[PDB]
Amino acid sequence: MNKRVKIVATLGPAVEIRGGKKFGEDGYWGEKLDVEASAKNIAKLIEAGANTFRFNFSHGDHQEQGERMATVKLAEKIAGKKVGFLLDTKGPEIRTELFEGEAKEYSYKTGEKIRVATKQGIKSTREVIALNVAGALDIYDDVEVGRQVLVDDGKLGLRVVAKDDATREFEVEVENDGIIAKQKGVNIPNTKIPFPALAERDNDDIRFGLEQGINFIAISFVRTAKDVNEVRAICEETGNGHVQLFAKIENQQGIDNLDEIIEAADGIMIARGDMGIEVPFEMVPVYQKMIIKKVNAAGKVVITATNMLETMTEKPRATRSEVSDVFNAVIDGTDATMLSGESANGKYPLESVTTMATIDKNAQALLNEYGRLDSDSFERNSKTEVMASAVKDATSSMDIKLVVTLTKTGHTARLISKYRPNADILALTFDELTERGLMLNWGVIPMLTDAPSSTDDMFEIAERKAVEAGLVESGDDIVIVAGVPVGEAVRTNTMRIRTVR
Amino acid sequence: MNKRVKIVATLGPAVEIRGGKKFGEDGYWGEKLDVEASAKNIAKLIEAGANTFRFNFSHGDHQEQGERMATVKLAEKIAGKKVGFLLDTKGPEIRTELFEGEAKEYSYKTGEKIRVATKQGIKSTREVIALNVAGALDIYDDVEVGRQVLVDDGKLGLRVVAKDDATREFEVEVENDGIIAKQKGVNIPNTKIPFPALAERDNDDIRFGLEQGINFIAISFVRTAKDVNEVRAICEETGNGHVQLFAKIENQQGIDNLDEIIEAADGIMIARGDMGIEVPFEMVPVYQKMIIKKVNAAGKVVITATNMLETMTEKPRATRSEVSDVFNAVIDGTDATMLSGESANGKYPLESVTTMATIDKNAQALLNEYGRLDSDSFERNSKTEVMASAVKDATSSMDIKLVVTLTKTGHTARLISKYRPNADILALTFDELTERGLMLNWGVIPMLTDAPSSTDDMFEIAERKAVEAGLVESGDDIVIVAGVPVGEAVRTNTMRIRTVR
Amino acid sequence: MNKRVKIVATLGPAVEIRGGKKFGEDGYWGEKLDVEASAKNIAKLIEAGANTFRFNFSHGDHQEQGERMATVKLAEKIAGKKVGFLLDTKGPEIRTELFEGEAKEYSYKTGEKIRVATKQGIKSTREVIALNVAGALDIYDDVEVGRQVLVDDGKLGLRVVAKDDATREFEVEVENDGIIAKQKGVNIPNTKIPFPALAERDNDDIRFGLEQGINFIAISFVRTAKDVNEVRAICEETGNGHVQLFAKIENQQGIDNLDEIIEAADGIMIARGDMGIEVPFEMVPVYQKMIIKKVNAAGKVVITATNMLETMTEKPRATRSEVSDVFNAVIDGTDATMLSGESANGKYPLESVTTMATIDKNAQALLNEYGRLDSDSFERNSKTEVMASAVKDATSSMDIKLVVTLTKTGHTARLISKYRPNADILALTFDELTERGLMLNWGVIPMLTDAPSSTDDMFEIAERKAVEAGLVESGDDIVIVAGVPVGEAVRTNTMRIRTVR
Amino acid sequence: MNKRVKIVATLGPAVEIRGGKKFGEDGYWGEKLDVEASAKNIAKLIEAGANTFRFNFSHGDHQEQGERMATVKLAEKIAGKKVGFLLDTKGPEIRTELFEGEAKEYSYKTGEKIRVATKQGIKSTREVIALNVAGALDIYDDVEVGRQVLVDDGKLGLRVVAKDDATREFEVEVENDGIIAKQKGVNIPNTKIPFPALAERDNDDIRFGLEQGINFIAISFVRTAKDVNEVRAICEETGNGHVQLFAKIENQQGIDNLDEIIEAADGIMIARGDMGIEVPFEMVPVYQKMIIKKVNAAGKVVITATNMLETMTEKPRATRSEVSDVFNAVIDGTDATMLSGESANGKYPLESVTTMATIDKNAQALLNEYGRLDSDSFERNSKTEVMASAVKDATSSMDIKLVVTLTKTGHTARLISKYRPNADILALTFDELTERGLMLNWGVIPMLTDAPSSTDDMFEIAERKAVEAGLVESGDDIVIVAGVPVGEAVRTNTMRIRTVR
Ligand SMILES: [Mg+2]
Ligand SMILES: [Mg+2]
Ligand SMILES: [Mg+2]
Ligand SMILES: [Mg+2]
């Protein structure tokens, strides 16, 4: 069987070996990276069914990230299977500042009264909490009395009951017992802090990433089309127009402007962590279903991500609720699922990938009977639409082992992908950028080949590759779809059903 | 603007000129056929939408029929358009014998008692009626007391009330006021007169016909598959495998065995004349609809025939009932309509064709909304069915001006024909037998061309021909369907939607 | 076994006995109506499936029509079954005037040149034709050069090639060999002769008719809603609100304004005679199907009329084309079929009815599989529509022998009628006007009974009547539908499936 | 809005107050129960939307359980809303024995070798583990070499590599690092230990429960129909035939025999805990979907249960994966969801109920567009089926606020429940057993009322109750469904749509 649902695995130290020393062993950070040993460990993740690696630019300097990408390049060589490179921007993050006296955290109780400091550069005390705002913004005038400041995944709330113009501070009340640790996430819902469309740090992060060579960018805290287009401008400036941009919907502004953001972007990442704090917690499953449906209708790529298998950071087997969650992400019709901590810094990086894939394959057995995605709802008054519909009805009506595309831009592959055929899709292409850019599209198995001389040659090549890759043998039925001639920039116009000789 | 429903026109004297004298004028039969001027009259029928000519071998010797076929051959050259040649067998006909004293007809009254003579060779009297049974069969032992002998289209009935073994005669009672003319048809329902599967006259008629060159044969009074296969054997023997056989369903045995007859034959002719006498009169519309449905499901050709525009034999304009009748034949999904008397020996042969075509085109504008044929009912587990389904859905979903196919055997053209696309079907072929054999298939325009070297050449040829024939112009969308490669004996597997340059 | 399609039979002399003498026998017109023996003949029509009688006020004075209505009243008492009374208006008819010298008809040839006289009161000559225009209108100023004057069912055409202002005449050319007899119909297509919305003769005809007691009125040559409302006003004035008005669509203005006419009227009569002359002949089947569809969607009654079984005027058995025509009227979803000449002044009035019913019952066995009416197309946002839908689905899903309704206004019966259930509809009512007014609605069997005291009593009455009428026996399933309470003016809201005890 | 999805809450100490002392405070078990104070706390759970309480007979003696049920009886009085009483059997549980020297647990490492003791009565050592098998069964001959013994929720595995016939012990290897605590669950998959269909302890538990008064029984570890029928026998013996039996599918034998078990039982409980250990972990979501679908098709009740909101035992807010899991249980079309530990012994009993309900209401907003259950797939050739389908289509086609049933046995309520109307269902009934037995049926709001005298009275009562309960006001549309007359034992036959006056 072929895992049709794509996997994004966040890379980190959990895979990286230093002087024969694994993550957790003391003075690990002291020793230097063994590139060969980690690449061998990364190769086991690729084999486990990871399709793309995520470089989270919230943590790690350019040296750290760029070296990691160099290791993956060699890991591809060991496994002999390519994968996509995804960069994740820090964006307008707010964190709790460091504590005076190397205090790591403090405990509070409900009813307690404390202050939050809007001044930048200063350290935290138990009595006053200093915020690290990205790009050193003053947020004093942008958060009002009665607003809510949340710390460590929204687990601890502080209600703003007064502002002091004298010190530019917020007087807050502790809503529940909890811990305020240093370097923890801060969220302030139902606010519009005037963060730039593009902050200078994120410009640098992307430019550094584009220089190393990336296939994707996930833009954090996308509020509007403007935020996506400011990144698009850089990609086109640097001669990286092939880079596909995922808007991360992390907040209410993102949901309100979802329609214009989906138009602007090449896909969406459902960022459930930040989203769960910013909107009612019991409403995240509603937005997850709605968002996947609309992105699919735009023919674009959706990633369901964050806390998919949270517990496997610490424990070898997931909870029944995590397994259910990953299971229904496939049944809503997500293109891709994402491991963040599980693969970056947990104790079970390879098992988390193996757990996620096995669930992904089991759900795809139930897609036919239970799948929430419907191809019938789509418009059918255009040549591409009737041609895709005919391919899907083929796979519906017969035992079709494989749909085989020859695609210059990969357009045909995204078209058939969108219709969710009851078959694996071979996407044959003529350049590596197009090959690696198709890695997150549902059911699509990208393969590099030589351009065809003619339509008959095209049909020869398609059968020859699928047979050589071992995907089909004699007696198996395949569908061959293309914009003929493939060399010219024409959209899908041709379909051929072939019994493999 | 392209008549999708085919027209079968019965040929006869009505078009034939003799010493410059039209049929009806004084001593016409004396003078010889002015072939050239006759062919001009047949040419105008073709130009007015006739697609096939019927040679009814019930009337006319071989010299008469063979001459007529020669005239049509020259008529196509005048028109510069080809048509199919259909032979209709006499079959197991019963007729009233000639009258003593050159009397033409006799009048009877209800309650009158008379006799019917089973002896062959003898003449008719007013008081005793002699039957001309095909091949001089004795029917005394095959007709029972209480059976019913019908004369002149079942307009006059005679009940058998007694048999006389001495004279081998039937004592009959006249059941309604009516005329018994000489040479009128005789029908006996609910009987099994043991006529041979193939009678010696019909073997010779077909052999003569096959020698001249015919594309179709209509077998009269088909009771069983056996009757069809006896004719099939001759076609195989003589090297005429390409000849397509229509079973004429003219009787109860034919209705009961319709399923095995449809398997045996290449299509059906609904013979409403004989059928109306043999079955309840008010049940003819039930059998017409049922038969069309089943023949379509077998992918074969159905012809609705007899009294389609009866009154246009005598009068320039048809009745509103006749216009209705031809109209609903198209809406039940007949491949073809047939004029018998209107074109063979009527006063308005050309007007009958013109009236029939205009009705045919009007009905075809209502086929989409009101058509009683449903292509969704068909099985869809095979590559021909999914490929035809995709062609039909294309024409459903877009403005498709033309479906174009390249077919060696014509299989693809019959396949798309069966699915009744909302488009004209250009069927490009490589031999005249295949061209002429496609002439009765719904919506199919057969055209001869050269075989394609390659699949891309195939796509070039299809667009080039449809543009040259004036069927499509620049900007128009076409579908191209084929079994690739066209030279190999493989069924339909390839579909291309092409914007005509 | 219950004829669902209603029959309208035109009454006339063909059934009327005079001094024991049938119509046709010597000096028939001299002798007086033997009412009792005539009523016996009308009784056998009702028994053979006539549901309504048509009094055509084009021919016959008030004395003649009023006597006929009296005979039908006594005919129902002989049959012990009731029927509806339909009056047909003369309307803006044009006829050829009487000939000088008691000449009955004259023969012309193509290319002949003659004149048509616009003066009123004058007689016809062979060389000059005088028109009898209803209400003595001058049509000289309302007909243009190049227009076409048709005589005897549009069988003979005269082209207006010149006008003479001096004599106020049209110079015409005979366009085909044909007869101009006296008292024959005259038609001028593509004209707006300014006939009044309601002419004084038709006001008096209706007033006379309403006085006798009629259930329906067919308004001839309806051009607009205005023409229908002028008649509506009289029905309201005279306390005859219950009279249901059928617009006869006889012309182009009627076709164009069909939408506003269907809103104004209680149903439509498809008048194929006049319509065939006024519109292209081969377009009559298009308008018949379209009109039936729209009238059904308005929940109203459609009657397909004229030349349904033409030949049975002269001959005992119809043509196969006529049987086809009446057959497809039922399959297009006509509520009723109408014999005009066949029952009014033909040799086979009772046989015509018997032939028509037998065809009607045969077609109704094919309505489920082939019926071109679709009740799924109807809007479903209201409680009547969901309630009717549920009744139709009940009859679809189970063997429902009968639908039984109790209706004060008859609204529920028209509702279920509109949805064309696969069941007979017993409509129990509380007054004769409502009983007789339901007689032309498809599948509805009107029966008088006593109002119910309660909903449970309603369910008792419905089962008791259907058992007593012999429509259902023990073990049979029925559906009971009503607007509860039946006494209150409320639309259908209640449905009960009952196994008959 | 009305929570349509039912909630089962497991009751326990977390709600019970002892000498003003809550669970966790030391020497709590010492003090006696305050009945009034706990009932006040249980009343807040009922208000929070708990519909049924589960008494888990694995933990607590008869004194403890029977007192708890007495408290709930008073809690109903405080809240003034009734709930169902569900008893859960211990069944063939295997637990780890107590440890010598009051050792609470021991730590092992992979590769370690230890023995498992099949002798009963004996205590545990670190070197030898003693099993507490229900009813003191010898399992030595029923578990084979190569089998797998799992402890604490299958988190620690021991592979059987040898059997010692001398001591009747299993030689085992530790598969993973883990803890073996005392009184922890033991599972041995792919074994058929010959536990009785009914063990003497479970007979006593049920008989004690039936005496106190229960509405439901959940039978643990159902393998076959036989296991369900042995409990059915007791219910009928004791005059408790109204008690509804849920088979808990906890094992492979249960899944293999699911069809015969669903026939035998009144519903199913998906017991995900035991099931997750007994079958592949990644396959629990597959069995959850399949099981819900089949139970629905049988018209029976399904409960999705175990670890629905696990983390809320310790923490005030659930994980995003738990919220997703509870969300998709509603979207698969579960009748009911279940809290076990969360409500029995966690720190957040009332918040767990409130969390579960809020999720349940949010999912039911998405049931219309995304619901996996389909009413169209059901048979429709029976009176009840067409009547339910008509009710569902009503709610589909209009804004129906409420479906109102009057039901003697509650049959009509289960019928409409099964079709999952887009409306709340008032189930009006005449006895408390029927009222409390309907509490776990999806969307059903049970209410006691007086029997109706007549059908009209029935329609009065239905509107009057729904208006008095505040469920509908003037202008709101309701559907009233019943087997008329309601007093007689007849299945559903009547439907009425009423605008609330
Ligand atoms: Mg985030
Ligand atoms: Mg014949
Ligand atoms: Mg008229
Ligand atoms: Mg369990």
Author numbering:
A (entry chain B), D (entry chain B): 21 to 521
B (entry chain A), C (entry chain A): 1 to 501
What does the paper say about this structure?
Our substrate-bound structures provide the first detailed look into the active site of a prokaryotic PYK containing the physiologically relevant substrate PEP and cations required for catalytic activity. The PEP phosphate group interacts with Arg54 and Lys248, which are ideally positioned to facilitate the phosphoryl transfer reaction in coordination with Mg2+ and K+. The binding of PEP and cations did not significantly alter the active site structure, which led us to wonder whether inter-protomer interactions between A domain residues are involved in the allosteric activation mechanism. The C-C interface rearrangement was less pronounced in the PEP- or oxalate-only structure compared to the FBP-bound structures, suggesting a limited effect of substrate binding at the active site in inducing this conformational change.
